[PDB]
Design a protein around this ligand. Structure first.
Ligand SMILES: OCn1cnc2ccccc21
Ligand SMILES: OCn1cnc2ccccc21
Ligand SMILES: OCn1cnc2ccccc21
Ligand SMILES: OCn1cnc2ccccc21
Lengths: 264, 263
C-alpha cells in the first residue's frame, strides 16, 4: 500500500483469500469490513501514528459511532480489490473516515463506505468534543475541500435508525466472543458486531438475496465476559431489516442497524 | 505466490495484518493456520485442481485427520512471512501436506507444520481408501524422494493422543459456530476447531506463556446446528490435554495437546 501523490489519501490492493469467501465464492461483508480496518491502520501508520502524541498523553482514543457499507459487487476468491481511504474533520463532533472499493482490472467502483468516529477517554469511557490543539495535529493529513464517499442529498449513511420493539421476528441468542474476536488490545473487534447482526438473518434470505447496504450504530461495547442476543424484524425485489444487539441478561442495547438486500 | 523451479512445491509471502495479531502484537496460531490453508489452496489451484477429475466423478473429497504446528517465532504485524508447502503420498493410507514458515528478511525458519489427509465419500462420509488410478493422478505433483517437515525419529507429530477423562481441570461450554466460521461449502472451517480448543486455556497461561506446539486429531465434524464443549487438563514448559465434544451427548469431535513456553 501507499499514500497517493498529494499525501491526503491511501491506497492498497488485496488478493481475496479462500477462507475469506462465502457460499457464492465471493468475499463476505465481514472480509470487506476487515480490509477497510486494515487499510485504515496502514494509512495511520504511513503518517506517523491511530492516536496523536497529545491524545496518548490525555489517555484519549478514537471510537466508532457508526459504520455504513454499500457493495455493488463482492470480489471473488483470487480477484484483486483496490481500496482508497481518507479522513476528514467534521468540526468538534469528531472525524469521518471514507473508503472507495474498486475492481483492479476494470477500474470500476464496486463499493463504498463511511464511518463516524468520536474522541473518548480510554479509562472513564467519557466522550468529548475535539479540542483545538488536538484537532490541529491531524488536520495536516486530511483534505481541506470536502471529499465524500456518499455525496447524495438524502443518502442512506445519515438516516436515523429506530429501536426494534419486542417481539422480534427473528433472533439468535447466546452469542459470545472467542479470543479470535478480540483485537491486539483485548477489545471485541468492530467487525464481530457486524457478524452478530447478520446471525439473525434467516438462511432463506442469505440463499436468495445479496447484501447491498448495512448501517450499524455502536452504542456500547460488548466486554469479553458479556453474552449477546441478535434480533431482526423485516421492515419492507428488495428486502429491508431492522436490527438490534443487546446484552443477554438485562437487555442493555449495544448496537442498532439496518440492512438492505437485493434478489440474486 | 508461485510453484518453485522443479514444480514440486509452492511458495507464497504474506504481510501480517493488524486484525490478525493478538495482545503480543504478533500473529495468532489461528492466523498462521489460515495462512497454511491459503497457501495449500493456491498450490492446488496452480497445478489444475482441490479434487482430481476422477475424485469429483466418484464424489470423493480430502478430509483432515490430524494437524501439527510448531512455531519458534510468531511474525509481528507488518512483517512478511514466506511459506513453502508440498504434498507426499503415504502408501494408500492417504496424503501428507507439509509447510515451512520463514522470516522473509533473515531467511530463518520460524515454524513448521504437517497434516494427514484421508479420502472420504462426501455423501456417505465413509472412508474409501486411495485406490486405482486416483493415486496416479496426483503422484506427478509430489516429490518422489521423502521430504519431511518433521524428519526426527519418534517426533511430536506422530505421538498417539489419549482421551481426557472427566472431570476436566478447565472448560469452556456452549461454543457455537457463526457464519464467519463456515467455508465456501458451508462446512465449519478446520481452523475454528483450533480456536475452540484454545478457549479452555486459562488466561494466566496466555499472559505468561507462548504457544509452541499444537497437535489436533479430527474425528467428527461439528455441524452448523451443533454446540461444542472445550475441555482442558494440565499434564505437566506447560503441557495440556484437550477434548472437544458435542454439548449434549458428549460425542467426541477432536482431541489434542498443546505445549507452552514461558515468555
Ligand atoms: O457470511 C455471512 N453472511 C450472512 N449474510 C451475508 C451477506 C453478505 C456477506 C456475508 C454474509
Ligand atoms: O487515525 C487517526 N486519524 C485521524 N485523521 C487521520 C488522517 C490520516 C490518517 C489517520 C488519521
Ligand atoms: O488469540 C488466540 N490465541 C489464544 N491463545 C493463543 C496462543 C497463541 C496464539 C494465539 C492464541
Ligand atoms: O489436495 C490435492 N492435492 C493432493 N496432492 C497434491 C499435490 C499438489 C497439489 C495439490 C495436491
Amino acid at each position: 500500500g501507499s499514500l497517493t501523490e498529494d499525501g491526503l489519501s491511501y491506497k492498497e490492493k488485496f488478493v481475496v483469500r479462500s477462507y475469506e469467501v462465502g457460499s457464492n465464492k465471493t468475499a463476505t461483508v465481514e472480509t470487506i469490513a476487515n480490509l477497510l480496518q486494515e487499510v485504515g491502520c496502514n494509512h495511520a501508520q504511513s503518517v506517523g501514528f491511530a492516536t496523536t502524541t497529545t491524545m496518548r498523553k490525555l489517555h484519549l482514543i478514537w471510537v466508532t459511532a457508526r459504520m455504513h457499507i454499500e457493495i455493488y459487487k463482492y470480489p471473488a476468491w483470487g480477484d484483486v480489490v483496490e481500496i482508497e481511504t481518507w479522513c476528514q474533520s467534521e468540526g468538534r463532533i469528531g472525524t469521518r473516515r471514507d473508503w472507495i472499493l474498486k475492481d483492479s482490472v476494470t477500474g470500476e467502483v464496486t463499493g463504498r463506505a463511511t464511518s463516524k468516529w468520536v474522541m473518548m477517554n480510554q479509562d472513564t469511557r467519557r466522550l468529548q468534543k475535539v479540542s483545538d490543539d488536538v484537532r490541529d495535529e491531524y488536520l495536516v493529513f486530511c483534505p481541506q475541500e470536502p471529499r465524500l464517499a456518499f455525496p447524495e442529498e438524502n443518502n442512506r449513511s445519515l438516516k436515523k435508525i429506530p429501536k426494534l420493539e419486542d417481539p422480534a421476528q427473528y433472533s439468535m441468542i447466546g452469542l459470545k466472543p472467542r479470543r479470535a474476536d478480540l483485537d491486539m488490545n483485548q477489545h471485541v473487534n468492530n467487525v464481530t458486531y457486524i457478524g452478530w447482526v447478520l446471525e439473525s438473518i434467516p438462511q432463506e434470505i442469505v440463499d436468495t438475496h445479496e447484501l447491498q447496504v448495512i448501517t450499524l450504530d455502536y452504542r456500547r461495547e460488548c466486554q469479553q465476559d458479556d453474552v449477546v442476543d441478535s434480533l431482526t424484524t423485516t421492515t419492507s425485489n428488495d428486502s429491508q431489516f431492522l436490527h438490534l444487539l443487546r446484552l443477554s441478561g438485562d437487555g442493555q442495547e449495544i448496537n442498532r442497524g439496518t440492512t438492505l438486500w437485493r434478489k440474486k
